[PDB]
Design an enzyme around this catalytic site. Sequence first.
Site, PDB file in Angstrom:
ATOM      1  CG  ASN A  40      -0.295  -0.556   2.457  1.00 48.07           C
ATOM      2  OD1 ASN A  40       0.879  -0.302   2.729  1.00 48.07           O
ATOM      3  ND2 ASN A  40      -1.062  -1.320   3.228  1.00 48.07           N
ATOM      4  N   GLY A  44      -3.502   4.378  -1.243  1.00 43.02           N
ATOM      5  CA  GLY A  44      -4.370   3.369  -0.679  1.00 43.02           C
ATOM      6  C   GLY A  44      -3.745   1.994  -0.836  1.00 43.02           C
ATOM      7  CB  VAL A  46      -2.075  -2.189  -4.834  1.00 38.94           C
ATOM      8  CG1 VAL A  46      -1.997  -3.092  -6.056  1.00 38.94           C
ATOM      9  CG2 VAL A  46      -2.064  -0.724  -5.242  1.00 38.94           C
ATOM     10  CE  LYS A  61      -3.709   3.794  -7.385  1.00 39.65           C
ATOM     11  NZ  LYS A  61      -2.840   4.495  -8.373  1.00 39.65           N
ATOM     12  CG  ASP A 157       5.885   8.590  -9.565  1.00 35.43           C
ATOM     13  OD1 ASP A 157       7.036   8.960  -9.245  1.00 35.43           O
ATOM     14  OD2 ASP A 157       5.210   7.796  -8.875  1.00 35.43           O
TER      15      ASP A 157
END
Lengths: 361, 358
Positions: A40, A44, A46, A61, A157
């Site tokens: 996580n 949140g 996964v 997710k 990212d």
Amino acid sequence: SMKVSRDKDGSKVTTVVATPGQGPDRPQEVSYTDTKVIGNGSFGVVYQAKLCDSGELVAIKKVLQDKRFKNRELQIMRKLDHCNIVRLRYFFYSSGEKKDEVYLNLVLDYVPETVYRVARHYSRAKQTLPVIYVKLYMYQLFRSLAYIHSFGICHRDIKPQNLLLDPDTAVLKLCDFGSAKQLVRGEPNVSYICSRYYRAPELIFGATDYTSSIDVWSAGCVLAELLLGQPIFPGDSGVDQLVEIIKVLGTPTREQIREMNPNYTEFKFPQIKAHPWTKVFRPRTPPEAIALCSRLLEYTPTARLTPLEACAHSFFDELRDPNVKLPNGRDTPALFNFTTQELSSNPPLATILIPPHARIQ
Amino acid sequence: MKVSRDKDGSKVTTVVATPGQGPDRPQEVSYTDTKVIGNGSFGVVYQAKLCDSGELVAIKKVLQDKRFKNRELQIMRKLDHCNIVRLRYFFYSSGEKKDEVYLNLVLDYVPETVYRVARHYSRAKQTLPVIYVKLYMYQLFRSLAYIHSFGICHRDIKPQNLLLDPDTAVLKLCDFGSAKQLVRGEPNVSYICSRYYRAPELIFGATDYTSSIDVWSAGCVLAELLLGQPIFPGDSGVDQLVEIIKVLGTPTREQIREMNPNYTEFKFPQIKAHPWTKVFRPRTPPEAIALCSRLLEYTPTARLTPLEACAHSFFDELRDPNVKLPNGRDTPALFNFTTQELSSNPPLATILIPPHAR
Ligand SMILES: O=C(NCCCN1CCN(c2cccc(Cl)c2Cl)CC1)n1c(=O)[nH]c2ccc(-c3cccnc3)cc21
Ligand SMILES: O=C(NCCCN1CCN(c2cccc(Cl)c2Cl)CC1)n1c(=O)[nH]c2ccc(-c3cccnc3)cc21
């Protein structure tokens, strides 16, 4: 709403009504079991789950749903369909006891490995990944970057943790779009996105007018990390990261600083000459890979290769060979089924990207 | 520099170095037993033994720009505090190979750091006793209150830069390679300060921050010592911010403007304020939680000054006349304040200096 139940050998089974990720809104009865967490953090949890009927493994997710606006990641995942991007199969809403808060669940593909873990297995045993796999993994990543950039979407990212891997088929799939956003010219964007080690220099300089070329820099940091066996630009602070960039790229000229952050953050760096890129890597490092790294890790953002231009680089020429195979004997994954959407940035590049044998009738 | 030996086969180096906190009259200094104790970015940090007093010292060797003068050195010669590492001497030397000048900073040697000491208790699955949390935090605030009175901001407060003498419980701040005098109106770079400890206005890329970024970083060290792990972790600014929202709650639009006026144009999930008492272990002293909430504030002007933190009720045990170290020794220097150190708020001397001090 979700309906928990059991099978007849035990096995708790969850059945939800979900919306297909792509296509028309025809609701779906999806039943899954064997739910187990696979990490996580921040956004949140996964989960991993097994579909009841076909037995396929999927990922779920689970994030908090802001009741104000719809989730930006969901609006992006639904617009995307690419073989090197993790597919959004379904999505549904649910809760969890009282809370009075709504959770958004994204049912995505499951891929058993990540580039971060694979590179760490080789790093711990004092060795580097075979170059053929480095060619395969980075080509598929640059293919995924050229696709989302065609829509104007920047991932923001790119890191080895977000690059999923099937070890048998050598397929790479980009994941985690919780930081992605459509970059419109003239609009400002936050400068605190992207993880350490992989932040473009304009991000370290706090710029807000950055383009999708920050993904190309981050992808360049991944390629160099796979060649070196360790991150090329490490550091716990932005100052430490910059020093490692000066060590390799050299001191950025005043015009290069203007292209990155035009604000000029008012700092003076020590004057260090340009590290000859060949001295950075191992002795037997392919010079074409060193050439690609230098063309990806440039101070001037507009000077970096586009994702489509990176795919056409000579470092990936072995993938275009008709006799290329994985070491275990199987064929390479699909590498040349480009779409018009994918080539829109530079359609003439298809003369290189699609080899002659890939067009045999 | 003149390399030679002793007469037992030990190798001894003799240089002509300038006293740090003196006029400008260089002496002949000889040291031996040189060993690397640190590396990265700036350069290498060695440890040596002075050939006279046998005193252990640290030598920070960095490359010298022939253009301007090293900003770290210019700050060190101005500093003289019991909770700051002292610049004994400094000298220049060659090395590497391209006739490049190296600046050497002969500093105090302190055998341990807060990072390493905390890492031991974290591994052993316990928390550092609160008395050591009191002593280390207090001396750190005393060091911040000193440099801030000069307008100097450290800009890199982290446990690795907090040296410790375990026997005497003395804490000494070190690593001023990022320190800079912050003048109102001049912009300063936003990419200073290490992860986990960056102030929120730094994450938002603000260039108008004040000395209160050290206070935020100080508060992150206090929370980490009470928890046994960093309180605001994250490999990106988004991850770091989210962990801050989970504790501090969603910052109001007023707090966003006070942090970074530009408004980086982002919308955050609306999370209520985590009750500070639910963040730490049940047996955490309430005075410690109270001090944390007054250091880790969104609005930088709403955070305590380093001097106001020294007078907090969390440090009342230190001002008890019967306090002693767990190993039996007395507490180190805690009340030898100077006029310069208290210039931010002189009336605070009634609390900071207990009736039993000097
Ligand atoms: O991450 C994936 N697979 C990893 C392979 C299995 N690993 C997890 C469990 N385990 C493991 C890991 C670490 C330590 C230990 Cl001790 C252990 Cl046992 C073994 C290795 N994803 C996947 O397959 N589809 C996805 C779709 C979206 C996202 C995602 C990630 C982050 C943010 N947003 C979305 C991730 C995946
Ligand atoms: O750091 C210092 N003392 C602690 C050294 C850390 N360890 C101590 C011993 N030890 C070690 C011991 C046991 C086991 C293991 Cl496994 C190990 Cl490795 C190995 C090392 N300093 C000091 O005493 N005076 C200084 C002046 C300036 C700076 C400084 C640092 C960074 C940037 N600018 C200035 C640092 C110190």
